Amino acid sequence: GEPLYTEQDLAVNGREGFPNYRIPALTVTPDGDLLASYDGRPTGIDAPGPNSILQRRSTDGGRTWGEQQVVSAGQTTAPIKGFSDPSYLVDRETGTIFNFHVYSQRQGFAGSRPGTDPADPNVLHANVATSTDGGLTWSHRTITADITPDPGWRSRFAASGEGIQLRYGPHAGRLIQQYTIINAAGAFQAVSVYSDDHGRTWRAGEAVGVGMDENKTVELSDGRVLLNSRDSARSGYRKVAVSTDGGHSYGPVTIDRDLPDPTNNASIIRAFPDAPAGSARAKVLLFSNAASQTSRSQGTIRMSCDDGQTWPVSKVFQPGSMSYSTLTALPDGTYGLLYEPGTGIRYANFNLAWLGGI
Numbered sequence: 001g002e003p004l005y006t007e008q009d010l011a012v013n014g015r016e017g018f019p020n021y022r023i024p025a026l027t028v029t030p031d032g033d034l035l036a037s038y039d040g041r042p043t044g045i046d047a048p049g050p051n052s053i054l055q056r057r058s059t060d061g062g063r064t065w066g067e068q069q070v071v072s073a074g075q076t077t078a079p080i081k082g083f084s085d086p087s088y089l090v091d092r093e094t095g096t097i098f099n100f101h102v103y104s105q106r107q108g109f110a111g112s113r114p115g116t117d118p119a120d121p122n123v124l125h126a127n128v129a130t131s132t133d134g135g136l137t138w139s140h141r142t143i144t145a146d147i148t149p150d151p152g153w154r155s156r157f158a159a160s161g162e163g164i165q166l167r168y169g170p171h172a173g174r175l176i177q178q179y180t181i182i183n184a185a186g187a188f189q190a191v192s193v194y195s196d197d198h199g200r201t202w203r204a205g206e207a208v209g210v211g212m213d214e215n216k217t218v219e220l221s222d223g224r225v226l227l228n229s230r231d232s233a234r235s236g237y238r239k240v241a242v243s244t245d246g247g248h249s250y251g252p253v254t255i256d257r258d259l260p261d262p263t264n265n266a267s268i269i270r271a272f273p274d275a276p277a278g279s280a281r282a283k284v285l286l287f288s289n290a291a292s293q294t295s296r297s298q299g300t301i302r303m304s305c306d307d308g309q310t311w312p313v314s315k316v317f318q319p320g321s322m323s324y325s326t327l328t329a330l331p332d333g334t335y336g337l338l339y340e341p342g343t344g345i346r347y348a349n350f351n352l353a354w355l356g357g358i
């Protein structure tokens with residue numbers, strides 16, 4: 001077809017109530033509405049800043065966006081509370097939407113102490129907001145205790161963006177959301193948090209790697225779950241691991257030289273999420289990140305047609321400043337992209353024809 005690439009800002013620093021906006025999360029409701037979530041930052045900083053989780057909705061495929069509404073409101077007055085780094089997760093079977101995020105008080109990620117008590121202001125808590133009405137109203141839950149099987153895990157945070165629901169195998173229906181934890185030795189590890197009962201209970205899998213950070217997972221054509229991670233040890237590339245199970249454990253972590261990265265968040269999705277297992281279309285992956293190894297710039301989309309082995313097609317969508325980016329498959333066959341150009345958060349829409357390879 002004919003190449004399509006358009007973009008418009010959803011939030012710009014200083015307008016609509018907050019001096020700074022950051023951290024994109026994007027998803028599509030079962031009704032087909034597009035939901036964009038991000039941080040509203042009063043002091044322009046990460047947790048423990050008294051941040052708010054915000055949301056904008058589009059009912060016409062991303063063309064027009066409704067007003068900025070608050071999902072979780074931070075408290076700028078003492079007792080200070082903050083809510084940051086959103087990640088959406090839609091249970092396509094039940095139609096339920098989840099929005100995972102941090103619940104901070106006195107500490108952020110690096111400073112969190114061990115503990116699980118919601119009342120303890122020294123721990124960085126894990127929260128989930130649940131909606132059964134398409135993202136209109138939300139019910140909140142602190143699940144730190146449920147996802148901390150090892151008392152030595154002193155900190156954690158859901159990787160911002162969008163999680164997944166498995167379609168194949170013995171664990172089909174399973175909701176997976178990635179987290180980064182800091183263990184007793186001070187090591188940064190990746191871990192899958194999942195639910196087999198459509199969100200009633202959440203539990204952690206086995207932690208993997210060292211030098212890990214914000215990480216994402218995708219279900220491959222054979223049902224294997226590929227983990228793609230930001231490298232906190234700064235190799236200049238993305239780290240990768242694979243899981244063949246559901247009681248999540250991942251194999252060894254290796255550096256992927258095909259994916260340069262300056263130690264920043266990225267997104268990896270299935271181009272055709274509904275394709276049947278083993279089919280050619282099920283092997284197609286899209287990846288968005290900053291390709292520069294020296295700075296957060298040169299935002300590009302890469303495409304693989306072999307479950308992530310090779311990435312023969314790539315195109316730059318933002319030559320300049322580009323930090324965090326997330327992708328989702330829209331029902332019209334195109335792709336939504338929420339990203340950070342340095343001025344707040346911007347929404348972009350593109351199709352495969354635009355990519356050039358196919």
Ligand SMILES: CC(=O)N[C@H]1[C@H]([C@H](O)[C@H](O)CO)OC(C(=O)O)=C[C@@H]1O
Nearest residue numbers: 023046047085102108109157213214
């Ligand atoms: C909970 C939290 O702190 N999230 C932040 C995250 C984290 O600090 C880093 O991943 C090192 O672990 O990094 C950044 C960043 O732009 O680099 C922004 C996130 O809001």
